[PDB]
A paper describes a structure:
The red/far-red light receptor phytochrome B (phyB) plays essential roles in regulating various plant development processes. PhyB exists in two distinct photoreversible forms: the inactive Pr form and the active Pfr form. phyB-Pfr binds phytochrome-interacting factors (PIFs) to transduce red light signals. PhyB covalently binds the linear tetrapyrrole PΦB as a chromophore. In these structures, two parallel phyB-Pfr molecules interact with one PIF6 molecule.
In the phyB-Pfr‒PIF6β complex, two phyB molecules interact with one PIF6β molecule. The PSM (containing the nPAS, GAF, and PHY domains) of each phyB protomer is clearly modeled on the basis of the density map. However, the PAS1, PAS2, and HKRD domains could not be modeled because of the absence of their EM densities. The N-terminus of PIF6β (with only R11‒S60 visible, hereafter referred to as PIF6N) is clearly traced in the EM density map, suggesting that the other regions of PIF6β are disordered. The two PSMs from each of the two phyB protomers have a nearly parallel orientation, and they are arranged in a “head-to-head” manner, which is quite different from the “head-to-tail” arrangement observed within phyB-Pr. Helix 1 and helix 6 (also known as the helical spine) within the GAF domain of protomer A, along with their counterparts in protomer B, form a four-helix bundle to be involved in the dimerization of PIF6β-bound phyB-Pfr. In the structure of phyB-Pr, the NTE is flexible and invisible, whereas in PIF6β-bound phyB-Pfr, the NTE of protomer A interacts with the conserved β sheets of PIF6β and folds into three helices around the PΦB binding pocket. The hairpin loop (HP, also known as the tongue) in the PHY domain folds into an α-helix and is located near the PΦB-binding pockets. The A-ring of PΦB covalently links to the conserved cysteine residue C357 in the phyB-Pfr GAF domain, and PΦB adopts an “E” configuration, indicating that phyB is in the Pfr state. In photoactivated PIF6β-bound phyB-Pfr, the D-ring of PΦB is in an “E” configuration; the side chain of Y303 changes its direction; and Y276 moves away from PΦB.
Numbering used by the authors:
A (entry chain A): 54 to 143, 156 to 379, 393 to 565, 576 to 621
B (entry chain C): 111 to 144, 156 to 379, 393 to 565, 577 to 621
C (entry chain B): 11 to 33, 41 to 60
Amino acid sequence: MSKAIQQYTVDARLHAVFEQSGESGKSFDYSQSLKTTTYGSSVPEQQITAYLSRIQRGGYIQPFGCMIAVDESSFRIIGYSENAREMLGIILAMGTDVRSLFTSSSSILLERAFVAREITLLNPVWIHSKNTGKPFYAILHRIDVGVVIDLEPARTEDPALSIAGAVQSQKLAVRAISQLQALPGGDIKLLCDTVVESVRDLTGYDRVMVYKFHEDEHGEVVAESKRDDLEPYIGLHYPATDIPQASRFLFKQNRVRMIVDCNATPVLVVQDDRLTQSMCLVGSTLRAPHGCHSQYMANMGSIASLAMAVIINGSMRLWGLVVCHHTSSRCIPFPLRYACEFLMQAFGLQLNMELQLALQMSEKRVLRTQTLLCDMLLRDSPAGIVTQSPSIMDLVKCDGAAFLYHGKYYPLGVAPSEVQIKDVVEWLLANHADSTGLSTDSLGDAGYPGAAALGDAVCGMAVAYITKRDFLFWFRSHTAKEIKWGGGQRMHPRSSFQAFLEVVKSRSQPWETAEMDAIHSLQLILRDSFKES
Amino acid sequence: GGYIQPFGCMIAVDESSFRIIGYSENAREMLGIMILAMGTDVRSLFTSSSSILLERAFVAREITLLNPVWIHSKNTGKPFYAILHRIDVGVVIDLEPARTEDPALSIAGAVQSQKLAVRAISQLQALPGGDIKLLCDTVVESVRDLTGYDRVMVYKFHEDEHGEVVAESKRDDLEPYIGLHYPATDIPQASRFLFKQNRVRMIVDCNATPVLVVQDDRLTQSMCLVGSTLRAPHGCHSQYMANMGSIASLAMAVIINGSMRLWGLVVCHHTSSRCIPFPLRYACEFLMQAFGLQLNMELQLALQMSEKRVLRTQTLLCDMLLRDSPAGIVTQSPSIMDLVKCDGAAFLYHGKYYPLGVAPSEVQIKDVVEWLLANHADSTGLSTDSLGDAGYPGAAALGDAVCGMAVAYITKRDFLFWFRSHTAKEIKWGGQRMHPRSSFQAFLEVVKSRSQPWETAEMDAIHSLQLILRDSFKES
Amino acid sequence: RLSDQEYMELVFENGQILAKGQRQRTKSIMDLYEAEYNEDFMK
Ligand SMILES: *[C@@H](C)[C@H]1/C(=C/c2[nH]c(/C=C3N=C(/C=C4/NC(=O)C(C=C)=C4C)C(C)=C\3CCC(=O)O)c(CCC(=O)O)c2C)NC(=O)[C@@H]1C
Ligand SMILES: *[C@H](C)[C@H]1/C(=C/c2[nH]c(/C=C3N=C(/C=C4/NC(=O)C(C=C)=C4C)C(C)=C\3CCC(=O)O)c(CCC(=O)O)c2C)NC(=O)[C@@H]1C
């Protein structure tokens, strides 16, 4: 059932384990929980439904702003955060008219915002508390039971200064986008580095880094701009379970999510007793992070956070994140968040450009290599495709290759010894004689009796059948060979790296669909050439 | 000095001393002063907070980082948006009155510019990513929704520098201009340079009387009223817009990678005077930036796919060459006509003529070969956009059917020809006085007997196939 | 046409994780701006 969709059960089980650890007064054993909670198995629909409700209908918000959910028509309050009375300087209770909590002009603007059909040009609204005059950004969104208003306090100053702050944030984002446009192109690493530097300059967080989500759904730190004294984290890989799939969905929903202080006490959202279930906070910008991620951030040493989703066209796909961490509490103004979202949209567009261009270039390179291989095979002996410079090892990304031809073994790079390759061929014939090739991440998981002997040097394989006895092999080493980072009960980045290395202990990198397509095309060409000889 | 549109005001001041060195005639009325005079401290014309903001903008290294300064007139208190830019002498301030006076609504609109830009760019993101026409149509619809102008169209500037209306969304009762072409001279190169510099050009009312900009007599040269957003349109373009029936205009440059290149424009026209508020203008500007980015993406992807298709065509032609005699390349479906965009092709092989599609007769092609030998004997290949311009005597005999012609040399007797007809063949549109119809007719006159230019990629493909066929002929 | 973002909730129904959505404009954004940003109420 896919990989992401299968991860929902693992997320639910880990969430339950964390909740039990909290209830019993124990400490969440991260490494043991990951080891015990593996993909597959069975989980009743009750558990997954409860996990989803607790994630999306937790009932707590961040104390840096307040929340008021009102009836769409009657403007009567159906829910409010416990800090709303203190935040607004305050009567506030169930059934109270929300228009009585703000000045007359603010109430009129709220009325105008509510009566909108599909799009409203007062969202957020700059409103003032009736009792104190405290300015707020009221960000409105619609939930099944009414309209939720996220009141984020705004700095008291001259309105010209607020407009100036918004203008400066947007112009910084525009300048960053202009810098992204004027790049050489065809280099994703340079794009990520430029975006990281621009985002750190724009937001001012202590640390800013880009996470790329792999087809496995695990994440990698592909870029970073940190404070000098802070520990580097570039090159770091962590399990897929560290960012639950529900959280990734919510990050696609909330394109810019801000956590002001992980150690701040969440504020309960008092709710009307007549509502069927807990209020939905999916769209709320004040939704508090679960204790799981709060504890993870506290252990990490990061207090504030600002995660911006990288969305590419794929019905959109979350290619990754751009997360800014701070060593102390940090709340940024809403205009700066929208400037960040605009910059992230530009980054997503250009990143999709780069990915498609890289796909085209890989196709062209594969075609050139195939043509050269055919030319050598036609005007040379078969060994010509392995004894010459553009050998089969250059067709796809691999740590080695091999050709078995009429009992002759021609290895290249890292390949099994002659006896080992005979054993592999015997296994393939015994168990996989009904196919014309197979791609394996790890020979150990595929059931090869002796993959341990090959060790970490040879983990993956992309054997292609040419005849009943002639074979083409492409070999890869375990992923940890190509992973280097300068660094497990506690939820800490080192624990995550160790757990990831445990997950991929005996697995190589996945065989990309394009690489297998290239292998199969080359296989068809070679089979056609040989069957006529 | 120069002239500005009466919908705003302009004051140019000395950067170091903030003393006014020039201003528009309507500045006093715009600011409610009707004091304002040469040498007056500009900070005395606005409130204290406005003066602080102006000073902060002045000392900024990159002034454009805070263009829209929200200031207030000291006399009337009305809000203005001051756009500040630098000139050779001092700083020019374009003061446009702000229709929204309520501070809360002003802040809300400032944030709504960002919100609307984000939503429009999100609409752009959802596109599959392999269709420029779809991108242009989406941008046109988004811009018309944001601004509400009667007409919104995308102009693409060809390699010739002439423009084509590649997309359009208009009022139902207006004449369509999609598919129209106009000469490159309709947009002077200076205007193109300005669109590259000042990405957004707004004309509120073409028929409004422009306002003179009086500058200090002590200034050596005329004030560089170039990057100003209030610059009045020239009489030529004002009369052109009046004739067209368009009173208001909002042109936005489409910028891609070239050093940046002006791919075209997204121009909004209105039948009556129009001046949309700043939040919508900036939402449109951000959407245009995102559109330029994605359009550069689409162009690069199109180049990659064109290269892939050309390589596949060459491979198929090689297979045909191996399978049979060379003439076989002009007998099967994947023929030389698929190598490059053309209206016809021809292969001369050992004195045998094999035409395809629109090609000249045997006598005409023999005459063409004789002309090529007489004038272009020492050549490995060539491309002509118009045979008449090159100097072929028989061009008139060929007519508009064959105007552009590309020759690839195989040997002294074997040739490959790619023939392309005149441009007006694939241009269709309904439609002296400066009018859209007159522009279209002038363009058709410019390209009367001229085909489309032969692209660099097309000639590279032709040369590659030429090399392959020369090697094959030498082998055979 | 442009519209405000609609937020969805994940639900586990029929053994599937479905992004079930929570819960018409004819005038242009400019007309909406003129309507909503009218200051007559401040007089
Ligand atoms: C006069 C001596 C020439 C001239 C000058 C001129 N043009 C522009 C800018 C534009 N001219 C456009 C006109 C066309 N051509 C068409 O056939 C057509 C139909 C759709 C249009 C809209 C054009 C596309 C622009 C920019 C868009 C716009 O602003 O409307 C300028 C710049 C003036 C300014 O913007 O400040 C000048 C000076 N125009 C002519 O037609 C003469 C040949
Ligand atoms: C519960 C046992 C798990 C948990 C839940 C959880 N994670 C997120 C989101 C993030 N957690 C990140 C993961 C890592 N892990 C690393 O190795 C690392 C980098 C050094 C980090 C920070 C991560 C990058 C995110 C995205 C947001 C962010 O970075 O702040 C969430 C949702 C976040 C939210 O509520 O905003 C939850 C609930 N985290 C774990 O690690 C546990 C296994």
